Design a protein around this ligand. Structure first.
Ligand code: CA
Length: 518
C-alpha cells in the first residue's frame, strides 16, 4: 500500500484518503456513486459496462503536447523546431514545467486520490514501472484496463520508473504569457520522468503518453518500439502487422492489438488491455470487441438512452467513441503473459487507392525501412511515419533502424500487401488477400521465385497458391504497361515528396535510393 507521506514527495499535500490499486469491484461502486458531478459521472449501460463522457476533448490534443528541453532531451529528442521539424514534440522550458506540475499537484492536494501502479511492457526485464495518480475513479479504471496489472507480490517491491499525474480538472490560466497553445496541457519531463495532464479528460492521453515515452526510452536501448498488432501461430511463429482484422485468425493467438516492443526475448505487448473504436460497432463485424463490452469495460463518449441502451451508431458528439477493457475480455489471446518469441514475418498493409501496388511484394531490408518510414495508405493518400507519427519521440529513421536490426537477427521477412484497389478501380478481393496472408505466414513466399516491378523495384512472386496468377502483377489490370507506369509515376512522386522531409539525416538521405524512382 501507500502512505500520504509517500505522495508528499511529489508535491501533493493534505491527502484525504488513498485508494491504492483498486479492484474492479471497488471501481464499479465508485463510478456509480450518485454524489459524483460533471465529467466524473458514470452511467450503467444495459450491457453491464459503465459509460463516461469526456467533455470537449474527445480525442488527443497534439497542439497541447510539450516535452521539457533540458540536458536529458536536448540532443536526443526529435524536436518540433529542429531540422525539418513536422511533429508535435514542442519544447517546454524547465520553469514552465514547474508551474504546470504545481498546477497539477495543487489540484490533487486536499483530495481523495486513486493511485494505480502498473507496468508498461509485458516482458519483466524490459518493462517500465508506472505510477498513475488521479482524483477520478474512472480515470484509475482506464489505466487499470490499459496497462499491465501487477500481482500483489509485484506490488510489494514496486518502484516507479515514471509518474503520470492526471489533473484534468485543472487548467493553466497563465498559458498565453507562457507561449503555450491553450490553457490545457499534456506535458512530459524525462529528467523527472513524469507526465502531466491538465484540462483534457480524454483517456487516450494517458495511453498515448506512455506510448510516446516508450518510443523514447526503448530504441535508445536497442529495443524496437512499434505501432502494430502482433499474433502467434500454433507452432510459435510470430507475425507483426502494420497499417489498417487480418490480425484475427482463430488459429493465431493475439499478443496485442496496438503497441509492441521487440527486445532480445521477442515481441511483447506494451499494454494490458485494448482501447477500441466503437463508432458503428456491429456484433457481426467485430464479435470479439462487442463481446468484451461487459462489466469492467469502460465506454467513453458513447450515446446511452434513458433505459441504458447504447446507440453505437450515434457519432453526433464524436466519431471517436471508444471502449477500454482488460485484454482477457478477448478469449483468443496469448496468456498468461502477452509476449512471445521473435517475429519472423512483418506485414505492411496499405490500401492503395491508386491501384498501383501489387497485392503482395517481398521487400528488401532497405525497402522495409523506406516503406516503414512512409506509412502510406489511400480513398485519398495519407502518409504517417512508422505508421504512427504522432507518438514518435525520436527521429523516424531511428525506429526503422532498430526494427530492421531485430528482423535481421530473426531472419524475418517483410511483405507489402495492397488491400486496396487495382487498375480496374475495383477492390482487391478479400479472398485473395486472405490467401496472400496465408501464403506469407506459412513461409511459402520467403524463397519463392519473383519478378521485379519497375519504378518501385518490388519483388513479386511469380505464383501464389490459391490465387489466380493474373492478379499478382498490378500492370495486368491496366490497358498497357505505360498506363500503369503513368499512375505509378504519380504515386511515386507522392512517395518521394513525402520522404524528402527525412533526408536531412544521413540515414534518410541514404534510403532515397530504396524508394520509387520517377
Ligand atoms: Ca494506436
Amino acid at each position: 500500500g501507500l502512505t500520504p507521506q509517500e505522495l508528499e514527495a511529489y508535491g501533493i499535500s493534505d491527502v484525504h484518503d488513498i485508494v491504492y490499486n483498486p479492484s474492479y469491484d471497488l471501481l464499479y461502486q465508485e463510478e456509480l456513486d450518485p454524489s459524483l458531478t460533471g465529467y466524473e459521472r458514470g452511467v450503467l449501460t444495459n450491457l453491464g459496462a459503465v459509460a463516461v463522457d469526456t467533455g470537449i476533448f474527445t480525442g488527443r490534443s497534439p497542439k497541447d503536447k510539450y516535452i521539457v528541453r533540458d540536458d536529458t532531451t536536448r540532443d536526443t529528442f526529435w524536436w518540433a523546431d529542429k531540422g525539418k521539424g513536422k511533429n508535435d514534440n514542442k519544447p517546454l522550458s524547465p520553469e514552465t514545467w514547474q508551474h504546470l506540475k504545481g498546477l497539477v499537484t495543487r489540484q490533487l492536494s486536499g483530495k481523495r486520490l486513486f493511485v494505480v501502479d502498473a507496468f508498461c511492457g509485458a516482458n519483466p526485464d524490459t518493462r517500465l514501472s508506472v505510477r498513475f495518480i488521479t482524483e477520478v475513479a474512472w480515470q484509475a479504471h482506464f489505466v487499470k484496463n490499459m496497462f499491465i496489472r501487477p500481482s500483489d507480490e509485484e506490488l510489494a517491491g514496486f518502484k516507479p520508473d515514471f509518474i503520470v499525474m492526471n489533473g484534468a480538472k485543472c487548467t493553466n490560466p497563465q498559458w498565453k504569457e507562457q507561449g503555450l497553445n491553450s490553457e490545457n496541457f499534456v506535458a512530459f519531463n524525462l529528467t523527472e520522468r513524469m507526465q502531466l495532464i491538465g484540462g483534457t479528460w480524454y483517456g487516450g492521453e494517458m495511453k498515448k503518453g506512455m506510448f510516446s515515452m516508450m518510443n523514447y526510452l526503448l530504441p535508445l536501448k536497442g529495443i524496437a518500439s512499434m505501432h502494430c498488432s502482433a499474433n502467434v501461430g500454433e507452432a510459435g511463429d510470430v507475425a507483426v502487422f502494420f497499417g489498417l482484422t487480418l490480425s484475427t485468425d482463430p488459429a493465431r493467438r493475439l499478443i496485442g492489438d496496438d503497441e509492441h516492443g521487440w527486445d532480445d526475448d521477442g515481441v511483447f505487448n506494451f499494454e494490458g488491455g485494448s482501447y477500441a473504436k466503437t463508432i458503428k460497432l456491429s456484433k457481426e463485424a467485430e464479435p470479439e470487441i462487442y463481446a468484451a463490452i461487459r462489466r469492467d469495460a469502460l465506454l467513453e463518449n458513447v450515446t446511452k438512452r434513458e433505459n441504458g441502451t447504447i446507440d453505437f451508431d450515434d457519432g453526433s458528439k464524436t466519431e471517436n467513441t471508444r471502449v477500454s477493457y482488460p485484454i482477457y475480455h478477448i478469449d483468443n489471446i496469448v496468456k498468461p503473459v502477452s509476449k512471445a518469441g521473435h517475429a519472423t514475418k512483418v506485414i505492411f498493409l496499405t490500401a492503395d487507392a491508386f491501384g498501383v501496388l501489387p497485392p503482395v511484394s517481398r521487400l528488401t531490408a532497405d525497402q522495409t525501412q523506406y516503406h516503414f518510414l512512409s506509412g502510406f495508405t489511400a480513398p485519398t493518400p495519407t502518409f504517417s511515419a512508422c505508421f504512427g507519427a504522432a507518438f514518435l519521440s525520436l527521429h523516424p529513421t531511428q525506429y526503422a533502424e532498430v526494427l530492421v536490426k531485430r528482423m535481421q537477427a530473426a531472419g524475418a521477412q517483410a511483405y507489402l500487401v495492397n488491400t486496396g484497389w487495382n487498375g480496374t478501380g475495383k477492390r482487391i478481393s478479400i479472398k485473395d488477400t486472405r490467401a496472400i496472408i496465408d501464403a506469407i505466414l506459412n513461409g511459402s513466399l520467403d524463397n519463392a521465385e519473383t519478378f521485379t516491378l519497375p519504378m518501385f523495384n518490388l519483388a513479386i512472386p511469380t505464383e501464389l497458391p490459391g490465387v489466380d496468377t493474373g492478379i499478382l502483377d498490378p500492370r495486368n489490370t491496366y490497358a498497357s504497361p505505360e498506363q500503369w507506369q503513368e499512375k505509378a509515376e504519380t504515386l511515386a512522386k507522392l512517395f518521394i515528396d513525402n520522404f524528402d522531409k527525412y533526408t536531412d539525416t544521413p540515414a534518410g538521405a541514404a534510403l532515397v535510393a530504396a524508394g520509387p524512382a520517377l
